Amino acid sequence: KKKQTEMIADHIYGKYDVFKRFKPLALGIDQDLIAALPQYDAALIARVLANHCRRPRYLKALARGGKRFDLNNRFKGEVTPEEQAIAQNHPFVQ
Amino acid sequence: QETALGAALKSAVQTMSKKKQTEMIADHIYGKYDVFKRFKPLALGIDQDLIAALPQYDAALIARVLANHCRRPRYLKALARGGKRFDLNNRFKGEVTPEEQAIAQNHPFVQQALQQQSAQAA
């Protein structure tokens, strides 16, 4: 498992810009990641995402706010005030 | 003794103090709205709903009370619990996303609060 996920992520941060550059991610990017990657498992694709969203860098991107982005780096929704404020007050961010 | 006009005059006068207006807003909100009293996940745009429903109070101090409320461990713990969000009328409106839920779940204040909550059960 861990050998694979380690490779799975490696591929994502390498293929998709939105993950490489830590932009707030579109709602439902899990379904899109699994759909776009049949080559992997649908819960270890999800695991790699869980890891990403807890990194201080992602929290900081949330605190910054603005639009969210889909796998093709297009605006799709945005960060809400409530989520932006929780990210800003977070122990990793303040 | 006291008139309706009299009571409203006294209230208006009291609202001139920022600290006093802030206590009044919180008491109003926790007293009137079950979604606040019970710390349910709040719908998108609740800030605007509160502002519209409370014209007797400054929008800025309303936002402040709201932001105080969402910073409380008990609120984060509610976000960690997840499920639906609720509007001012205690009706379903939207939900807590997996991302919001995971962030609240890993929040230090929740790690504490969840540990306390279960130690009060034991």
Match 């122990």 to its residue by tokens: A91
Nearest-CA neighbor of B103 among A58, A54, A22?
A54
Overall number of domains in chain B = 1
Write the DSSP string, B47-78: HHHHHHH-TTS-HHHHHHHHHHHHHSHHHHHH
- 10 Å CB burial of residue A45 (0-12, 13-18, 19+) is buried
Nearest-CA neighbor of A35 among A22, A25, A50, A45?
A45
Instruction: Return the CATH number at B87.
Output: 1.10.1710.10
**Any CB–CB contact under 8 A between A82 and chain B?**
yes
Determine whether the interchain pair B103/A91 forms a contact, defined as Cβ–Cβ distance below 8 Å: no
What was the elucidation method? X-ray
**Any CB–CB contact under 8 A between A94 and chain B?**
no
Contacts of B89 (CB under 8 A, 6+ apart): none
Domain region containing A81: 1-94
CB A56 within 8 A of CB A6: no
Cα separation values, B84 from A50, B31, B42, B94, B98, Å: 21, 22, 9, 6, 12
- Spell out a b/e string for A55-67, using b for 16 or more CB atoms within 10 Å of the CB, else e: eeebbebbbebee
- The interaxial angle of helices B59-71 and B46-53, nearest 10 deg, is 140
Q: What Å resolution does this PDB entry report? A: 2.2
Cβ-Cβ contacts under 8 Å, B106 against chain A: 54
